């Protein structure tokens, strides 16, 4: 995360770390959406231009974390993967359209003060909150600039109007994405970056005071560049696929 700040303890208890078993390293962020389902970016698991194609047994899920590198005895929980599900129409070839993946855990994880699922938006929450100028929150252990943080970072970013998103980039944008961040004139800044991939963009509903995951950290050109924005998978637009997977294999 660029230009963010250290998270408070328990501030993002749905935060999940995707961890490579060998060598032991961070791979991506991710989120807890129930006691056995983790949500992330497809590109965290499958990105052939980088020779990335992970299978279940390559990975661990670490939940309840704060410190990036420390093993957080009696607090974090580490889970193995039963199954990875990637969107059948995920477009790694061109623009990361439908950049979304689910991971089913072998065993249920115990909720705790540091571990708790985030909500996924229904149509009305999506329509009310995904408005230009409304801010969300994104969290992660990725790069601090375009080194690495000691603990989970947080940054709040305003959603940006679709024409501005499109005009900032040469990439072909779709309805399955939204962009967020400050304009160069707005002063303030911040962005996701390398390693934040797959982590959640959340918003706190003023209707029921619950946190909803509206986006997934997906792509950006560099990090925290003036005139450029972070692009997030539009979780609501792909919810039917999410429900479908969970309904069928859960």
């Amino acid at each position: 995360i660029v230009e963010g700040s250290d998270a408070e303890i328990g501030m993002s208890p749905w935060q999940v770390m995707l961890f490579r078993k060998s060598p032991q390293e961070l791979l991506c962020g991710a989120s807890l959406i129930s006691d056995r389902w983790v949500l992330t970016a497809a590109h965290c698991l499958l990105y052939p231009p980088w020779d990335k194609n992970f299978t279940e047994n390559d990975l661990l899920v670490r939940i309840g974390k704060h410190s990036r590198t420390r093993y957080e005895r009696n607090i974090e929980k580490i889970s193995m993967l039963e199954k990875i599900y990637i969107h059948p129409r995920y477009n790694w070839r061109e623009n990361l359209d439908r950049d979304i993946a689910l991971m089913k855990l072998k065993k249920p994880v115990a909720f705790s003060d540091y571990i708790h699922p985030v909500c996924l938006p229904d149509r009305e929450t999506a329509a009310s909150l995904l408005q230009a100028g409304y801010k969300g929150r994104v969290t992660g252990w990725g790069n601090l600039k375009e080194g690495q943080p000691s603990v989970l970072q947080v940054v709040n970013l305003p959603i940006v109007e679709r024409p501005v998103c499109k005009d900032s980039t040469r990439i072909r944008i779709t309805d399955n994405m939204f962009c967020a961040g400050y304009k160069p004139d707005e002063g303030k800044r911040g962005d996701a970056c390398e390693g934040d991939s797959g982590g959640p963009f959340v918003m706190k509903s003023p209707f029921n005071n619950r946190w909803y995951q509206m986006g997934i950290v997906s792509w950006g050109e560099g990090c925290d560049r003036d005139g450029k924005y972070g692009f997030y998978t539009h979780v609501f637009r792909l919810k039917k696929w999410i429900q479908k997977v969970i309904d069928q294999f859960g």
């Binding site: 003060d113 540091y114 909150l129 100028g133 801010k135 969300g136 305003p158």
Partner: peptide, 27 residues
């Protein structure tokens, strides 16, 4: 059922340091 309610904040009626920034933007 209890998604989105953090044990250490919403469940205790404690606010984190910057969630009000989000509220104030929901205009």
């Amino acid at each position: 059922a209890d998604c989105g309610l953090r044990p250490l904040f919403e469940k205790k009626s404690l606010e984190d340091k910057t969630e009000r920034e989000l509220l104030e933007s929901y205009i």
